[PDB]
């Protein structure tokens, strides 16, 4: 009875095999579970189809004469005031627009055949409030603007899904910064001052470490008893670790040395190695004990999944 035709925009149109009572072919398509209908002079699938939502919104599909382009418009019941408009080309490039209660543009997304896109939102004044550019490798830049058109926030996402997000104050200074690594862990910096110093939080799997940011380095700090562990992170992200114990007793005091070749901190008390804390490439920490002679590692390294286990290692 019908021939199904595939169109730009993952749409399908059904064309009657036979002409109807007139010199015309009947067209039906379902878009978002609303059936649209029309009639055309041609039997290729081109034409205009229309339907009406339950709430009296008018939906109009226009398929170009050569099937090179489809336009799908949703209007208010007046049939003129736009609610949304989607234009797709055969080469899979599209333009999707949403409109506010006035029928003025409020969002626009333009997608190219390679899947890169640009997205803009406009405020109730027709001013740009957000913009996101996504590249073919899936890297992106995202910007948000305030009412003065000043940059309020920016996020740069790399192809490996690592990212740097910044919030800016009215002096144009970074007040907050979040660095997300490709492993998914994050460094969060808040309260950034004019000298580039602030509070620092490292968000790891199962726990969070807290410390401070200077222009020189981030330092995260875990304290247990008289022992303090400091994880330093350089600007380029290199981790080094140190341990200080205030214990004055030669019998009990911990000291540690860091091997940056193995990313391992080895703790000694009373002349024997006691444990090795390895800071792995996936930003996790493992711990393994030396046998009571302090000269060989025993058992197996254990991956730390909670903050209490790091404290327990510093006992």
Q: Which stretches within the chain are classed as H helix?
A: 307-314
Structure tokens at 268: 């000694």
Q: Total domain count for the chain?
A: 3
Measured in angstroms, the resolution is: 2.0
For residue 67, which phi and psi values (nearest 5 degrees)?
Answer: 60, 25
Last residue of a domain, one of 37, 61, 77: 77
**CA 131 → CA 118, 120, 145, 156, distances in Å?**
7, 5, 9, 12
DSSP reduced 3-state for 312 = helix
**CA 153 → CA 71, 121, 168, 263, distances in Å?**
34, 14, 6, 35
Give the domain extent around 154: 78-216
Do 141 and 193 fall into the same domain? yes
Experimentally determined by: X-ray
Strand partners, 200: 189, 211
DSSP reduced 3-state for 20 = coil
Query: Smallest Cα–Cα separation from 224: which of 313, 289, 286?
Result: 313
CB 221 within 8 A of CB 211: yes
In whole angstroms, what is the distance from residue 245 CA to residue 20 CA? 92
In whole angstroms, what is the distance from residue 39 CA to residue 45 CA? 10
Structure tokens at 271: 């002349």
Q: Which DSSP category does 218 fall into? A: E
Element (H, E) at 260: none
Do 115 and 196 fall into the same domain? yes
Structure tokens at 134: 């996504």
**CA 264 → CA 143, 269, 304, distances in Å?**
40, 16, 14
| Displacement of CA 63 from its chain's centroid (Å) | 35
Do 38 and 3 fall into the same domain? yes
DSSP reduced 3-state for 82 = strand
- The vertex-132 CA angle with 127 and 133, nearest 5°, equals 125
- Say which residues have a Cβ less than 8 Å from residue 92's Cβ, sequence separation at least 6: 8, 111, 113
Last residue of a domain, one of 200, 216, 232: 216
CB 279 within 8 A of CB 263: yes
Query: Smallest Cα–Cα separation from 241: which of 276, 190, 200?
Result: 276
CB 36 within 8 A of CB 19: no
Interior/surface letters 160-189, b for 16+ CB within 10 angstroms, e for the rest: eebbebbbbeeeeeebbbbbbbebeebbbb
Do 164 and 203 fall into the same domain? yes
- Say which residues have a Cβ less than 8 Å from residue 101's Cβ, sequence separation at least 6: none
CB 131 within 8 A of CB 123: no
Sheet-wide strand order for 285-289: 254-259, 264-269, 272-279, 285-289, 302-303
Do 261 and 137 fall into the same domain? no
DSSP reduced 3-state for 175 = strand
Do 221 and 250 fall into the same domain? yes
Q: Domain containing 63 — which CATH number?
A: 2.40.128.160
User: What one-character-per-residue DSSP string does 105-156 give?
Assistant: EEEEEEE-TTS-EEEEEE-TTS-EEEEEEE-TTS-EEEEEE-TTS-EEEEEE
Last residue of a domain, one of 77, 109, 144: 77
In whole angstroms, what is the distance from residue 105 CA to residue 84 CA? 9
Q: Domain containing 244 — which CATH number?
A: 3.90.930.1
CB 51 within 8 A of CB 36: yes
């Amino acid at each position: 009875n019908s021939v199904s035709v595939d169109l730009p925009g993952s749409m399908k149109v059904l064309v009657s095999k036979s002409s109807n009572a007139d010199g015309k072919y009947d067209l039906i398509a379902t878009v978002d579970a609303l059936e649209l209908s029309g009639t055309s002079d041609k039997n290729n699938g081109s034409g205009v189809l229309e339907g009406v939502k339950a709430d009296a919104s008018k939906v109009k599909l226009t398929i170009s004469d050569d099937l090179g382009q489809t336009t799908l418009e949703v209007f208010k019941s007046d049939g003129s005031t736009l609610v949304s408009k989607k234009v797709t080309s055969k080469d899979k490039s599209s333009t999707y627009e949403k409109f506010n209660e006035k029928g003025e543009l409020s969002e626009k997304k333009i997608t190219r055949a390679d899947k890169s896109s640009t997205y803009e939102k406009f405020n109730e004044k027709g001013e740009l409030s957000e913009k996101k550019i996504t590249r073919a490798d899936k890297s992106s830049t995202y910007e948000k603007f305030n009412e003065k058109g000043e940059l309020s926030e920016k996020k740069i996402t790399r192809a490996d899904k690592s990212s740097t997000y910044e919030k800016f104050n009215e002096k144009g200074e970074v007040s907050e910064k979040i660095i997300t690594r490709a492993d998914g862990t994050r460094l969060e910096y808040t309260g950034i001052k004019s000298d580039g110093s602030g509070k620092a939080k490292e968000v790891l799997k199962g726990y969070v470490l807290e410390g401070t940011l200077t222009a020189e380095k981030t330092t995260l700090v875990v304290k247990e008893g008289t022992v303090t562990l400091s994880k330093n992170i350089s600007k380029s992200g290199e981790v080094s670790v140190e341990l200080n114990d205030t214990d004055s007793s030669a019998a009990t005091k911990k000291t540690a040395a860091w091997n940056s070749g193995t990313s391992t901190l080895t703790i000694t008390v009373n002349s024997k190695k006691t444990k090795d804390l390895v800071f792995t490439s996936s930003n996790t920490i493992t711990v393994q004990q030396y046998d009571s002679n302090g000269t060989s590692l025993e058992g197996s390294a254990v991956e730390i999944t909670k903050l209490d286990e790091i404290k327990n290692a510093l006992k």
